[PDB]
Design a protein around this ligand. Structure first.
Ligand SMILES: [Mg+2]
Ligand SMILES: [Mg+2]
Ligand SMILES: [Mg+2]
Ligand SMILES: [Mg+2]
Ligand SMILES: [Mg+2]
Ligand SMILES: [Mg+2]
Ligand SMILES: [Mg+2]
Ligand SMILES: [Mg+2]
Ligand SMILES: [Mg+2]
Ligand SMILES: [Mg+2]
Ligand SMILES: [Mg+2]
Ligand SMILES: [Mg+2]
Ligand SMILES: [Mg+2]
Ligand SMILES: [Mg+2]
Ligand SMILES: [Mg+2]
Ligand SMILES: [Mg+2]
Ligand SMILES: [Mg+2]
Ligand SMILES: [Mg+2]
Ligand SMILES: [Mg+2]
Ligand SMILES: [Mg+2]
Ligand SMILES: [Mg+2]
Ligand SMILES: [Mg+2]
Ligand SMILES: [Mg+2]
Ligand SMILES: [Mg+2]
Ligand SMILES: [Mg+2]
Ligand SMILES: [Mg+2]
Ligand SMILES: [Mg+2]
Ligand SMILES: [Mg+2]
Ligand SMILES: [Mg+2]
Ligand SMILES: [Mg+2]
Ligand SMILES: [Mg+2]
Ligand SMILES: [Mg+2]
Ligand SMILES: [Mg+2]
Ligand SMILES: [Zn+2]
Lengths: 119, 132, 146, 62, 161
RNA sequence: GUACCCCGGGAGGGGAGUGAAAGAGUUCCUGAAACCGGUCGCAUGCAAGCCGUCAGAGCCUGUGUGGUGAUGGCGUGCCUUUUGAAGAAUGAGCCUGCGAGUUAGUGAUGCGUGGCGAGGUUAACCCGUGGUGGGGGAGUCGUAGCGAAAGCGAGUCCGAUA
RNA sequence: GGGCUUAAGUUAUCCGCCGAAGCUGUGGCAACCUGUGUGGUUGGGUAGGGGAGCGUCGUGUCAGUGGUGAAGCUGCCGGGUGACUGUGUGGUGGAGUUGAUGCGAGUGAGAAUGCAGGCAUGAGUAGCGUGUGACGGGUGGGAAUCCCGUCCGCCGAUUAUC
């Protein structure tokens, strides 16, 4: 029962070389280099899937800060005022408002202002 | 399989467009040295190409010229086109069989010598197809 | 999907800051913020959404302490013994544009886009600028309370 | 010395593409009865002649 | 099934080259298993696969195999399958107590049922056995068992209570 | 096993013929990868890059999915061996093929599972020239241990029938 | 790092915010324990232990299947938690092979300065092995390098002859 390796062996090679189908140089042509690069790509993508939450939250916070500073309020005071007012709209929707519906955002800024400690 | 139009060189080089082609296979010259002349000859009018290759100093100018002439002759026989209204639409060089040889070096060593070959393909079409 | 600006979607404005008696650091922070569009809700780090900043009276920039002589700016040509040093006071008197541009560049991300956005900072040591065709509007450096 | 690493395809092609020639230019024979291409400042291969249309001379009996 | 180890391959006695100084990997023979044409490491060598199954297990398995199709009513007993000389046609007609498919004909001895054996020999859907050679594989393989009267007598007399 | 015609000194090719198929044309079944190129789409000549990953405009295509991808963030190869290696420690130019825990014991010792069970099981060998089936209990393990042993025995040994 | 004393420095105090794969929210998967209708706890991992599987080849049986096109190769569109995969859909190919359940392995490679073959990199790069050739004509598809001739040069205790 002598078995030849090729039929079983080429499957993972085809898979890896398909996953490396935009890489530059040896990384898209040779199975060993493509395998190393796919190891790195998997590590990178797992890490960036977790870092995406923080990245998008940072972008939302920056946009909310910019839109609330045009109304004379800092981001920290705006967030504290929305917390005190009870309006639980998250930073994703707050940034969506700050871009698309700036009048609704300014009304929310007024709501946050009226709900500050003022002390 | 049981499908029509088995693949052919004409269908891949011309594909129902008027024109013709020629291939010189196993030319005992390296593919790079043939390409140095083929890059000059590609896209040119065929008669201008053969007259220029008559004067090109390179050794690969004599093979390629012949190929072009053969292509022109083919177009003058299967299509009725004249030589003066043909242009070299496509031109490329592929590698042929490379013979292995040994050159004896110093201190009992032998270095490897590769005798390379080339296949030269030239496809000619009427000049009216240059912009179409 | 979070909003992303499209190429030339966000309009870029022209501003003129009067740097008379304005601290170099305050002016540089404000200019870097304006150049990168950090004051806009449509901000994007990868798309240039910033404005054009003109700074006049760049020779009258205020420096505290002994900075006009003791605060040094260095350059090196790369060949040995090729270091030159000047003071920020002499830079402001001689090449105010270079001084303001160095201060601003130190305050931006080290990028290709930042090198493109620094080209929007026009600096003049005198009170006048040649950009009246672009109608720069006055900008006042101000702080928001609390 | 000896190459430390295999040259990349980009760099190899960058250098190799500059190994190229130029096309020979060629000029029409001034002889009306020849009209064949030859090299500039060179006698015509087809008629062996040289000179302007007015004053031709034979350089090669070929 | 046999293979050659590195010691059984032709040649390979001498060291291919020096241990040090050549710039090549260390090799001790040309027939080392990583060489093309070298020895095989753990390839097959001749062996026997017969197992020392206890007798009680073999007998019980044959019993259960027979009972499975005694309860399925696929066991038939006949006096014979043929009269006189040896026809395959006649006992082919006779074995149509069921469909001629995966049948097993249990006859007695090599001589007491010479005619029946030679008749059923060529049916290719009939496996013919002597009663003393009843085994589990041929019974589990069969869809019907047709005993001859004397074949059943021999089997029952050989093994029983 | 390619008559004949065309370009060519030939090689080679183009028509044509044979053949079911010639891109089955003698380098002849199938014809992978490395590697070498022609064509088309996008990007690319102010830029610092383990070459990816996430965010993302634009263009092409739209076979409304796919190609490319300016630009922003994050990001120091693989293996071995080390307290510790991206390491300027080892090995590897690349691809294809091959290349390392196997087999034999009526071996030792466990476990799972099946048969039989105070019993279990055969070895050589014999019969089946029809095999994987049947016989063969010689031996062997369990059935009582303790003691150097004679021996005694649910006891035995050191001991004084302690 | 820019820049900072007009603190963006030290210090005391107060009010907010940012910030991890931590915790919470929501949607899947898995191990163990537990009452056995709540659920609870748990699931980073080298050496290493245990458990369960993917793929390759041969093979008993059953059901098949294949020139109305098997294997193998190569695309596209899909699927699973993984090894992987479709009984989707083409192309090439031209004679085998699929599923269920068992049985046996020469059963999986990225590395051993591993073995064989093929092909890159260096690179159209180094070298082309002491030197003297020039011209006229011929041959030829093609001539610095072949033939003939004339000049000239070279060896001549040897570049001769045996
Ligand atoms: Mg988080
Ligand atoms: Mg020698
Ligand atoms: Mg370079
Ligand atoms: Mg030996
Ligand atoms: Mg030895
Ligand atoms: Mg052998
Ligand atoms: Mg014929
Ligand atoms: Mg084919
Ligand atoms: Mg072939
Ligand atoms: Mg550019
Ligand atoms: Mg840097
Ligand atoms: Mg360790
Ligand atoms: Mg150490
Ligand atoms: Mg290293
Ligand atoms: Mg290194
Ligand atoms: Mg070592
Ligand atoms: Mg090395
Ligand atoms: Mg957690
Ligand atoms: Mg774990
Ligand atoms: Mg482990
Ligand atoms: Mg059929
Ligand atoms: Mg097979
Ligand atoms: Mg199976
Ligand atoms: Mg193996
Ligand atoms: Mg391999
Ligand atoms: Mg290797
Ligand atoms: Mg090369
Ligand atoms: Mg050169
Ligand atoms: Mg060089
Ligand atoms: Mg050189
Ligand atoms: Mg040289
Ligand atoms: Mg002579
Ligand atoms: Mg002399
Ligand atoms: Zn002329």
């Amino acid at each position: 029962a002598r078995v030849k390796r090729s039929v079983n062996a080429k499957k993972k090679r085809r898979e890896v070389l398909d996953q490396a189908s935009g890489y530059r140089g040896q990384r898209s042509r040779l199975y060993r280099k493509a395998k190393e690069q796919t190891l790195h790509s998997a590590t990178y993508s797992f890490r960036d899937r977790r870092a995406k939450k923080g990245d998008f939250r940072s972008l939302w916070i920056q946009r909310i800060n910019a839109a609330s500073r045009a109304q004379g309020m800092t981001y920290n005071r705006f967030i504290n005022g929305l917390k005190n007012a009870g309006v639980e709209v998250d930073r994703k929707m707050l940034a969506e408002l700050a871009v698309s519906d700036i009048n609704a955002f300014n009304s929310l800024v007024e709501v946050a202002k009226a709900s500050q400690p003022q002390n | 399989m049981s499908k029509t139009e088995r693949p052919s060189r004409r269908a891949a080089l011309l594909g129902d467009r008027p024109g013709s082609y020629a291939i010189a296979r196993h030319v005992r010259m390296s593919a790079s040295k043939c390409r140095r002349v083929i890059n000059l000859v590609r896209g040119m009018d065929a008669v201008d190409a053969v007259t220029m290759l008559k004067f090109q100093p390179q050794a690969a100018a004599e093979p390629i010229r012949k190929v072009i002439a053969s292509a022109m002759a083919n177009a003058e026989q299967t299509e009725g086109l004249r030589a003066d209204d043909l242009y070299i639409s496509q031109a490329f060089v592929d590698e042929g069989i490379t013979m292995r040889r040994i050159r004896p070096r110093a201190k009992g060593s032998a270095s490897r010598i590769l005798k390379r070959s080339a296949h030269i393909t030239v496809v000619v079409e009427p000049k009216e197809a240059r912009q179409a | 999907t979070t909003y992303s600006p499209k190429a030339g979607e966000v309009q870029r404005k022209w501003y003129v800051i009067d740097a008379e008696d304005i601290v170099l650091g305050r002016l540089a922070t404000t200019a870097a913020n304006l150049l990168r569009g950090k004051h806009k809700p449509q901000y994007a780090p990868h798309i240039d959404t910033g404005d054009f900043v003109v700074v006049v009276n760049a020779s009258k920039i205020a420096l505290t302490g002994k900075k006009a002589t003791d605060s040094l700016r260095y350059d090196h040509s790369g060949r040995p013994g090729g270091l030159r040093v000047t003071s920020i006071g002499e830079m402001l008197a001689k090449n105010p544009r270079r001084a303001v541009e160095r201060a601003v560049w130190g305050m931006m991300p080290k990028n290709k886009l930042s090198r493109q956005q620094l080209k929007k900072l026009k600096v003049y040591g005198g009170p006048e600028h040649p950009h009246a065709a672009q109608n720069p509007q006055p900008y006042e450096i101000t702080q928001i309370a609390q | 010395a000896v190459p430390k690493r295999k040259m990349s395809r980009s760099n190899t092609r960058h250098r190799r593409s500059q190994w190229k020639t130029v096309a020979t230019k060629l000029v029409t024979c001034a002889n009306p009865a020849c009209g064949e291409k030859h090299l500039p400042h060179t006698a015509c291969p087809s008629c062996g002649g040289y000179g302007p249309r007015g004053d031709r001379r034979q350089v090669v009996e070929a | 099934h046999a293979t050659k180890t590195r010691g059984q391959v032709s040649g390979g006695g001498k060291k291919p080259w020096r241990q040090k100084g050549t710039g090549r990997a260390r090799q001790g023979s040309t027939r080392a298993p990583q060489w093309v044409g070298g020895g095989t490491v753990h390839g097959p060598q001749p062996r026997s696969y017969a197992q020392r199954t206890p007798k009680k297990m073999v007998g019980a398995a044959l019993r259960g195999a027979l009972s499975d199709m005694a309860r399925d009513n696929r066991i038939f007993v006949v006096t014979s399958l043929v009269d006189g000389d040896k026809p395959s046609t006649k006992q082919a007609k006779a074995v149509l107590s069921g469909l001629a498919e995966l049948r097993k004909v249990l006859v007695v001895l090599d001589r007491s049922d010479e005619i029946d054996w030679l008749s059923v020999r060529n049916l290719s859907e009939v496996h013919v056995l002597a009663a003393d050679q009843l085994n589990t594989y041929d019974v589990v393989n069969a869809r019907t068992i047709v005993f001859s009267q004397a074949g059943l007598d021999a089997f029952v007399g050989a093994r029983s209570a």
